[PDB]
Ligand binder design. Structure first.
Ligand SMILES: *[C@H](NCC(=O)O)c1c(COP(=O)(O)O)cnc(C)c1O
Ligand SMILES: *[C@H](NCC(=O)O)c1c(COP(=O)(O)O)cnc(C)c1O
Ligand SMILES: *Cc1c(COP(=O)(O)O)cnc(C)c1O
Ligand SMILES: *Cc1c(COP(=O)(O)O)cnc(C)c1O
Lengths: 466, 463, 463, 466
């Protein structure tokens, strides 16, 4: 009864060693490994400090102008400040754009928008998953609707030309006239090229649909002006706040304000629809600590240092891509305009499925992903590689070239094992051969050692060992 | 870059003074004020430290043993540990219960469940809002569906007897036969009494429906064993992790496993698939670590005691207000909150919540079972979790009751000066513009804030 | 071809003897039997002649003044004439009412309206089936949606007081506030009392819902002014054109025009668009001509008298059965039918309808308000429209009542021989296999059929 | 009160002169005019006599094996007989096919099937209207769902190659993988070619969807074996009973029974689903008189005389098509395989919209319909012409050639008027110029006279002046 009070102060290290120990082991893993997973990054210490603030304590359902409870004087200073920085960072005119900073994460942001502009069973079109789209843009089979989007709404994806790896805009333009989408999505989870926002705008207006951009993967790039901004032609832009924007996990919803089209003019009604859908529609009390962390991230995002960070991110990607091309690897669409590349491993007689696991054992983090061609989804040809994370650690062109070599050493290993299994062997067996065969296991150890030594050369953003 | 590094490792105080200054002012407001909002509380320092960990960086969409990406060795230790502590804290047998610890918050947890067990347009019944229910349990009018629940699903609420303030179980039992709910919700946002989970189970099984409990408000109480556990009769239990459980903002979904009656339970996969890849993306592992910390703390006798205190404080507060002549809906409480019907003082919570606020006494309005108009709620909701976490005891709350009373009197005064009839905006105008009043507010605010300063404020050292 | 012509102009009797023979046998069955099925009647020869016209050939999708194809000069004269007679027959002012005469039948008419005013998943409330409602008004269980209405829309029925047999309007008024119906239905398939249209209008307007009346069973009565007209308070009135209106099988949708309260009514276009191009294709003009003929006949004093007779027959029949000790649900009737609760004789309509049938007395079972099991309905429904169209009068029906009674006794006998407990199939077995019984049936069948022969059989000369 | 009894007998001619008079004027119009509307025909006297029977009187909800009421002894003989003739007429094995004969009409039959196999919001694909599809196969715009099908279900149409006038099966095959239809429709309202049922079956099975054929327009042809039967590859076949089958207005739903696919085999569950959907799902008491009329039509349909009638129908169409080709008219897909042709009037500088109305004034019945090309739906290029009706009157190749000339005389007239109005004139004005201009009105009279004289030469099926 007395200690209860001593209990609320007691640092985490003392109060709970088991959790603390985990956090440590994780921090250390993150250090010695090479993070190449496109969606990963490292939040600054400032952002992380915010999440721990007393901002966790206040409930503030509603919005600045009107909340359900009182005493929100400061939360209001915060949310408001956060919006000013969100529009500012993207050079948006507060008279043409508004922004909701309450989404809990990326997926939630998208759903809020669908719930506000589409409505139950409304039609939605997005990049087909195996072509590089995201679940939240639609995901169903001929027998079941898996994604929440594909359950409460009616989704149909558009594909990319399997010979150029590019989005087939012509086919999409045609299909839209038959499908009558209420909303078309412009966003990708694994696509190395800029999107033709201008085209998509013509296609959306043609069918009277809304054009929503999902810049979760390029949000940071867009800010530094390293890739074309989606705010030029889109009606709405949703985004995560982590990944390339390097903040804590949360999401935002940008929406236009003002005159939409003449004749005599009609206005944009997105604001209230979207705000009402987030709340009291879908969410409850906002996570203010996460909002503070985003605000911090946006301040940092407008600095020239960030600006430079991004230029570096993209250049690293290019050098990495070039290095792998030179090693004889095939890059979908032959190259990239951003932070990632899809390496088609068919050109080496293996697949990303087996390859991602071997590279992992060597502490080289990345993931598989089908290439435009691929006939089977149960044996994806590609590996996706992103440079945001490692760049935030300081890696430069020279550094990545060495990385490319490490990945190549891995692909070779992966191949060595695969021929050691059989044409009709399963991923289960493959994985099992890699676990109980000192022969390969030794090789792994050797490369893991090299991988982890190199990684140790760079610092690890975050708190002092946390 | 030369500087790019230092930036990422720099402290918040230096890196961003504007945000830091805000956090400070907030920390200080929380200190000198008296938090009586039922849903509020204060997370311990341990929980808060976890949210800042490097756990923010790792993406781990999927589940332990079923992750999309590799390198989840530790996240797995975590999520798993978190589930072991979640079932443990509630004395649940891992063979009869499972638990999803990925929800981002309370509302999301509920939706995940609806999406898994109900399905588009499936019928759902829950406590009607003005009677003390939550939006996520359904909220629509005769012309529009507002809540996500009421949009993607078909909701119809059940009310409470307006003369006892209790849930009319008889009427619900009858209406279920006509509405055919696929799922009935057992949970409240402003209800001072235990729920007849046993009854609701009979009603659910009668219509072959699922009985989902939403213990967001009493999650902490349930753990200390201070209120009956909803796990005895329910098929599913959703909950927030903050509020009375005192963790960071997140949510959990408890579901049964094993035999239902031979027939089994298929809740597990349905619910897991609905959270992901159904509704969410990468889980917020830092929030999960904070919950884990909260659950360890929740199983301590100190927490156990904290809860006993919470409920006792509420009683004393309730008694003190009764003695001051206030009417308590259903006459009392079995938990951490009470709905004070201000009709018995000639005013309403709408005007009263704002005046009390100006005096730094935090709380909120809420219609009472009677109330004919929703635009002039008779009640004020008062909870004791927050102030109890600061150390307040029976004696302390009695003083609090007095402060609230002083407030109600003030709010009434601004009323008599405005006239028995006047719009809410008229009322607030006097509150602000009037020497005797704005002055009165200052006086009570001063006393309120002095008293509050006497107690500590949980959290990280000094913000 | 040499023969191809003659084929198309040949008579049915020669062209197809098998079908012709069937029609004959049916015509003859209809003659010697006693039709007491509430929904049955006999169309006049004029109506029947219309169905055979060349009106079958023309396709006229659309509406007068809005046809897809040309050459509709006459179809237009027809449809238009039909509408003039439909509004006329019900004394409706063409400035306050419009009418669609294209529905293919009763059920289609209702669906057209739901599709126009409700919309996918819109809520609808109607009389619960076991209490006397129609499928099209909603029909689902706790596990499946059976009726089209209950599939594409969200239906919840209201019941009747099981002790008065009357519709519990108080409970309905209450539940509407919780269910938020977009449309409430006023219509019955087996209810002997007038509906409180005035009440239902208050309830509909309270929830901003539409009040749709389904007068399929009393359409003819309403015209003769023998029962209160539903056009006084309703927004829409759907109806079949057969049954008590005595026309061919088809349906109509009456809807209001003008001012609703300034606000207007937008029902017209919604409903017309929903019938076409919404739900149907080319209208069956021959059926429309038959309806027109029926409406002209319906406005005659002879029809007017026919109806008065129909209702009087029912009363006498009801009285005669009461005197024989039978229990009538709600104790009596205000129209053409009565629900005889056979519990008061130790049997059920299920067994009874089949025995009476074997004796050539046509009628059907139907649960009574009380009834605990739907697999053993207590009641028998009896209507007088059909037999009245044959000329039966009070005296005649009293004899009929006796015949039905003789039947109930027989059905009971087969019961006592089977034992207080026995499955329905067991019962029917005795009915058939047993000298004393199959013999008894023959005896009563003979008397039933002799009496029936005494009256004429409306329709075309001799089939 | 006394007369009431005399009222139920009193013939229609006496009981109601106003209706009778109408029926007469209609019968006479049908006689002197030339019916070329593809969906029209003339029911035999036998069929018409059935509709008037006492079969109107019995209520028989349910089905032969189980009805809600009794005394259905004969209705059962009927419905049953009707089904035996429906399967018989199409040479279907009662062990592989079943049939529902209760639909009230064509549209209702389709909906019953959708309600049974698709379910609310289930996806359905069908021929796009402007390409020759039917409303019931789906009809919506980018802003509204018009058809019942497009309201309660999710429909997306497939088009035809605008340069061949044929259905683009390749594009459909592709789109099905993105749309995931639960049911694909094989049926047309204005398409002169056979459908590749075999192809559509591959496409349906590929996506695990049902293949429903809607043979409303070729039902009669299919029976005579003049066009390929859709029962060879389809799971379900819906049809109207009038049109080319020449019965009264009603509809039927044919469905398969037995083993569907092996591995070990799975069965067809269509029967109960469809029956339950018709009733108690969608309809009430069946219209037995209409069913008797259908039965009569099916008996007549199996005769060699009918068989011959159909061969004639198709040959007439060809000669008509040839005659118009020779007159310089353009026929979509250049010809026909059945009873109709879509004449693209662009090749004469006019459109079907103006042309259908002028031909009408000349007592030549037909209708407009957009051609594959057509940029605007408010100025369809084509006219649809069918031969079923006129053939049932006895017209032969020589006769149709004369008909073609009459239609041509009309198109010329139509053109004369149009140049007399202006490039930017409306159909309202066009129609009005044709009504109040003795100049043209005189021409019309002249051709109407010739048209009506010729028509008088042939008999008019049906009753003796009814
Ligand atoms: C918490 N809201 C109660 C209040 O009055 O503020 C809650 C929730 C939502 O949690 P959240 O974290 O997203 O805001 C859901 N369900 C219940 C029963 C309660 O009490
Ligand atoms: C007629 N069915 C009543 C019965 O008990 O048989 C009916 C209908 C359906 O008409 P239909 O012509 O398609 O069969 C619809 N609505 C009502 C109220 C009744 O009474
Ligand atoms: C990663 C990603 C998401 C997922 O974000 P969460 O915050 O993890 O839930 C959503 N959309 C797109 C386009 C993405 O790349
Ligand atoms: C004509 C046609 C219909 C319409 O039939 P109705 O009986 O008039 O309702 C339906 N489907 C197709 C394919 C058609 O050609």
């Amino acid at each position: 009864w007395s200690s209860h009070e001593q209990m609320l102060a007691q640092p985490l290290k003392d109060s709970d060693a088991e959790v603390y120990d985990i956090i440590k082991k994780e921090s250390n893993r993150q250090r010695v490994g090479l993070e190449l997973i496109a969606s990963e990054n490292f939040a600054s210490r400032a952002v992380l400090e915010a999440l721990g603030s007393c901002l966790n304590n206040k409930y503030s359902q509603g919005y600045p102008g009107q909340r359900y409870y009182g005493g929100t004087e400061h939360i209001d200073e915060l949310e408001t400040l956060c919006q000013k920085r969100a529009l500012q960072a993207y050079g948006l005119d507060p008279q043409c754009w508004g922004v909701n900073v309450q989404p809990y994460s990326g997926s939630p942001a998208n759903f809020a928008v669908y719930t506000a502009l589409v409505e139950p069973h409304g039609r939605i079109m997005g990049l087909d998953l195996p072509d590089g789209g995201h679940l939240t843009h639609g995901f169903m089979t001929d027998k079941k609707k898996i994604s929440a989007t594909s359950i409460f709404f009616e989704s149909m994806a558009y594909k990319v030309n399997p010979d150029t790896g590019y989005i087939d805009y012509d086919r999409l333009e045609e299909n839209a006239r038959l499908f009558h989408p209420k909303l078309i999505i412009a966003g990708t989870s694994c696509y190395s090229r800029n999107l033709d926002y201008g085209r998509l705008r013509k296609i959306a207006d043609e069918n009277g649909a809304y054009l929503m951009a999902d810049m979760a993967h390029i949000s940071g790039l867009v800010v530094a002006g390293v890739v074309p901004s989606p705010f030029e032609h889109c009606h709405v832009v949703t985004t995560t706040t982590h990944k390339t924007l390097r903040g804590c996990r949360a999401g935002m919803i940008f929406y236009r304000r003002g005159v939409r089209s003449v004749d005599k003019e009609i206005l944009y009604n997105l604001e209230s629809l979207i705000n009402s859908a987030v709340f009291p529609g879908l969410q409850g009390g906002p996570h203010n600590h996460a909002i503070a962390g985003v605000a911090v991230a946006l301040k940092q995002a407008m600095t020239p240092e960030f600006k430079e960070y991004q230029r570096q991110v993209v250049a690293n990607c290019r050098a990495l891509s070039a290095a792998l091309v030179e090693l004889g690897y095939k890059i979908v669409t032959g190259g990239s305009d951003n932070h990632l590349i899809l390496v088609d491993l068919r050109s080496k007689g293996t697949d990303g499925g087996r390859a991602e696991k071997v590279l992992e054992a060597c502490s080289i983090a990345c993931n598989k992903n089908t290439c435009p061609g691929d006939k089977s989804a149960l044996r994806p040809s590609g590996l996706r590689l992103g440079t945001p994370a490692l760049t935030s650690r300081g890696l430069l062109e020279k550094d990545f070239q060495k990385v490319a070599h490490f990945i190549h050493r891995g692909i070779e290993l992966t191949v060595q094992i695969q021929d050691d299994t059989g044409p009709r062997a399963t991923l289960k067996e493959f994985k099992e051969k890699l676990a109980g065969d000192e022969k390969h296991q030794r090789a792994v150890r050797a490369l893991r050692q090299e991988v982890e030594s190199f990684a140790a050369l760079f610092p690890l953003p975050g708190l002092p060992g946390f």
